[PDB]
Amino acid sequence: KTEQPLSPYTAYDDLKPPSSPSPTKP
Amino acid sequence: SKKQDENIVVNKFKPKEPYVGRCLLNTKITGDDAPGETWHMVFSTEGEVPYREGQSIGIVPDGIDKNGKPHKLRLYSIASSAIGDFGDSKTVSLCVKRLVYTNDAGEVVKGVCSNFLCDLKPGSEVKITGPVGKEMLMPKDPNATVIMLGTGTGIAPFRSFLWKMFFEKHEDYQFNGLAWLFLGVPTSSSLLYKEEFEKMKEKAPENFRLDFAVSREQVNDKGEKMYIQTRMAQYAEELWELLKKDNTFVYMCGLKGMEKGIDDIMVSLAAKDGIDWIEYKRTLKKAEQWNVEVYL
Amino acid sequence: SKKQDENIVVNKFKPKEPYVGRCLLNTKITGDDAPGETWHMVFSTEGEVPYREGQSIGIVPDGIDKNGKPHKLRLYSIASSAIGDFGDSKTVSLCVKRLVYVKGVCSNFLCDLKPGSEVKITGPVGKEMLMPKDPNATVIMLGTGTGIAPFRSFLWKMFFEKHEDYQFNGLAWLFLGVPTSSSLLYKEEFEKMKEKAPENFRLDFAVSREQVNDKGEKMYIQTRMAQYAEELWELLKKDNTFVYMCGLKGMEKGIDDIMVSLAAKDGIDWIEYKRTLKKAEQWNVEVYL
Ligand SMILES: Cc1cc2nc3c(=O)[nH]c(=O)nc-3n(C[C@H](O)[C@H](O)[C@H](O)COP(=O)(O)OP(=O)(O)OC[C@H]3O[C@@H](n4cnc5c(N)ncnc54)[C@H](O)[C@@H]3O)c2cc1C
Numbered sequence: 001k002t003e004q005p006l007s008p009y010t011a012y013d014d015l016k017p018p019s020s021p022s023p024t025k026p
Numbered sequence: 027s028k029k030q031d032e033n034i035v036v037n038k039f040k041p042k043e044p045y046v047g048r049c050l051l052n053t054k055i056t057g058d059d060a061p062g063e064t065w066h067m068v069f070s071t072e073g074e075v076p077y078r079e080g081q082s083i084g085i086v087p088d089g090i091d092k093n094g095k096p097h098k099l100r101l102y103s104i105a106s107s108a109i110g111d112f113g114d115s116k117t118v119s120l121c122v123k124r125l126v127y128t129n130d131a132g133e134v135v136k137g138v139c140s141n142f143l144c145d146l147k148p149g150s151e152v153k154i155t156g157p158v159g160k161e162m163l164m165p166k167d168p169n170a171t172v173i174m175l176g177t178g179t180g181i182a183p184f185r186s187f188l189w190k191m192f193f194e195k196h197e198d199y200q201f202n203g204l205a206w207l208f209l210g211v212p213t214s215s216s217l218l219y220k221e222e223f224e225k226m227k228e229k230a231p232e233n234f235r236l237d238f239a240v241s242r243e244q245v246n247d248k249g250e251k252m253y254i255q256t257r258m259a260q261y262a263e264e265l266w267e268l269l270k271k272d273n274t275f276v277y278m279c280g281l282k283g284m285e286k287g288i289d290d291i292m293v294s295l296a297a298k299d300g301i302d303w304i305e306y307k308r309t310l311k312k313a314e315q316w317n318v319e320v321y322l
Numbered sequence: 323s324k325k326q327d328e329n330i331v332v333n334k335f336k337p338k339e340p341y342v343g344r345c346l347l348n349t350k351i352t353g354d355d356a357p358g359e360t361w362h363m364v365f366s367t368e369g370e371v372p373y374r375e376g377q378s379i380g381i382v383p384d385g386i387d388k389n390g391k392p393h394k395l396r397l398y399s400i401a402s403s404a405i406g407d408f409g410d411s412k413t414v415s416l417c418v419k420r421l422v423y424v425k426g427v428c429s430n431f432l433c434d435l436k437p438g439s440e441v442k443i444t445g446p447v448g449k450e451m452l453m454p455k456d457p458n459a460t461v462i463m464l465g466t467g468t469g470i471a472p473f474r475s476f477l478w479k480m481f482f483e484k485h486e487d488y489q490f491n492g493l494a495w496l497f498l499g500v501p502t503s504s505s506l507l508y509k510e511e512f513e514k515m516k517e518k519a520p521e522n523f524r525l526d527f528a529v530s531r532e533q534v535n536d537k538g539e540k541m542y543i544q545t546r547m548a549q550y551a552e553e554l555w556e557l558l559k560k561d562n563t564f565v566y567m568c569g570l571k572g573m574e575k576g577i578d579d580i581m582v583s584l585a586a587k588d589g590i591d592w593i594e595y596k597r598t599l600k601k602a603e604q605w606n607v608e609v610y611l
């Protein structure tokens with residue numbers, strides 16, 4: 001199986017959160 | 027199977043014994059001048075709620091009703107992908123519209139659960155039930171054409187779909203089809219998550235199409251209000267051709283009634299091609315290609 | 323100063339009245355097979371803690387000291403860039419190793435934190451490890467263990483973010499020393515950066531218990547640096563080269579040893595040369611424990 005992640009955001013293509021969890025208003 | 031229903035789960039938690047989560051973040055995502063307020067909230071789940079894209083969770087708001095019984099649960103489409111907005115699989119997010127309106131008698135009605143949710147502050151507890159539903163699960167085909175038609179909070183399941191499709195890396199799923207999102211809202215101040223969708227558009231310009239329909243502002247060439255169906259009509263040719271393909275899946279979510287306007291445009295589209303939309307829709311529905319989740 | 327200290331903020335919050343943040347996430351980033359545990363955690367700050375790359379924040383762990391008074395604060399290098407992991411300037415991240423020597427108070431309190439719980443934050447603290455202003459400078463980062471924290475902060479701003487006022491186009495070289503491969507903190511993030519900016523980022527790992535040089539010696543950070551002796555020395559002779567070192571106190575020794583050999587070739591005394599670099603803001607050290 002794939003090795004255990006050594007980074008917190010390996011679930012994302014860019015290895016970082018894609019956007020803020022406190023979305024910007026229009 | 028045509029949908030991602032591998033080992034799906036529902037009702038792990040019931041209103042009798044809900045999962046007690048905590049609000050981590052709660053943000054108003056609509057402009058101060060929007061007709062109503064819509065909030066994006068993130069709740070901790072400790073990874074105990076096994077939900078997937080397209081499902082909903084029930085919320086039992088605090089308090090009691092007129093007859094001294096706990097409030098009945100209200101359902102909310104999950105706005106986050108299965109792994110949550112943090113990517114750690116320990117949270118769930120909702121896109122909630124604060125229900126407030128004045129009736130003919132001049133009495134203001136404040137919805138119990140929606141106001142409870144929008145009033146939640148970081149640290150407060152929230153009673154969660156579910157997961158709930160299977161009607162809006164994603165297509166299994168990673169090369170499918172996915173047309174998403176939403177109004178208002180109906181954007182929720184589509185945000186869930188899109189985060190998995192364009193931001194996440196999965197061993198068993200690599201989307202390379204065409205996702206087309208149509209979102210109808212009354213004002214520009216009512217646009218939801220636009221910044222997020224624009225990022226997706228820049229990341230995958232050939233696999234994602236994005237169209238907003240701001241009904242109280244925009245109009246077509248004839249001067250008609252830009253409802254979701256009005257925007258769809260501007261791509262009549264393109265959409266009709268996609269609808270005739272077996273790998274095209276349509277999803278509709280939002281306020282009940284949006285369905286009527288869409289049927290009107292579809293009846294015309296099919297007719298020009300010598301087809302009876304009402305019957306064609308039945309065909310699509312049985313083929314799992316016309317998925318609807320609308321609410322009053 | 324040659325560093326990014328414009329409108330810098332320090333000591334906005336004091337231990338007497340800390341900023342109360344909330345834990346958003348806390349994940350163990352070391353593999354199960356690692357001998358110890360290191361956790362990556364994110365706290366919400368409501369944007370009230372205006373820190374920048376290279377600074378630290380203090381944490382007053384919950385509980386009481388032997389006299390029933392609040393615990394003294396412990397400092398932690400911020401592992402996130404100024405805008406934070408979520409790019410909204412509303413969060414801060416730490417890279418914490420569970421300490422046992424008795425159980426360390428603050429490190430274990432932090433690694434035990436669950437999403438939703440409150441954490442007392444002080445600071446920001448520090449000006450020593452700030453980034454160079456020159457966007458085309460050579461930035462050499464030498465870290466061991468959690469010492470990787472400020473460098474993750476640096477690298478995120480350099481390669482994971484877009485800034486109208488800052489476009490890094492120099493050379494960033496990271497050396498990270500750890501005991502095992504299961505202890506290579508943030509490995510995937512750095513490899514992604516290397517794939518993204520192959521000409522502006524160099525990456526070298528030194529796994530002491532698994533690697534050895536051509537002489538059969540354990541691969542410590544200095545042991546790996548020695549393989550690029552010529553290159554590093556040439557870079558150290560340039561005025562736009564800034565070196566940063568962070569991690570456990572003691573890592574300095576081994577590095578000086580290999581350095582004496584380098585400077586020696588050019589008839590230069592390392593210890594004094596390093597001193598001139600330090601006073602020129604080009605040799606910045608932050609070691610602890
Ligand atoms: C599958 C599904 C997904 C949903 N997703 C979302 C979402 O993502 N975001 C979001 O904001 N909302 C969503 N909703 C709507 C949500 O469930 C609540 O109905 C809404 O928030 C109003 O709730 P309330 O408790 O605030 O109002 P209430 O206090 O319950 O008042 C609602 C009003 O409905 C009227 N009435 C008419 N029909 C009914 C009925 N069938 N049941 C009870 N009362 C009725 C009454 O006049 C009442 O005052 C969803 C609903 C469903 C079924």
Ligand SMILES: Cc1cc2nc3c(=O)[nH]c(=O)nc-3n(C[C@H](O)[C@H](O)[C@H](O)COP(=O)(O)OP(=O)(O)OC[C@H]3O[C@@H](n4cnc5c(N)ncnc54)[C@H](O)[C@@H]3O)c2cc1C
Binds near residue numbers: 398399421426427471
């Ligand atoms: C600028 C700066 C940045 C830092 N950044 C980080 C970081 O990014 N990540 C991180 O994990 N830590 C970092 N630290 C270390 C952190 O501040 C704490 O010292 C560490 O977590 C131990 O804390 P504790 O509260 O758990 O231990 P404590 O309860 O305070 O016990 C540790 C104390 O034991 C004493 N000493 C006695 N015996 C031993 C022994 N056997 N081993 C070691 N010390 C001994 C020392 O005085 C030491 O301070 C940083 C320190 C500084 C000054």
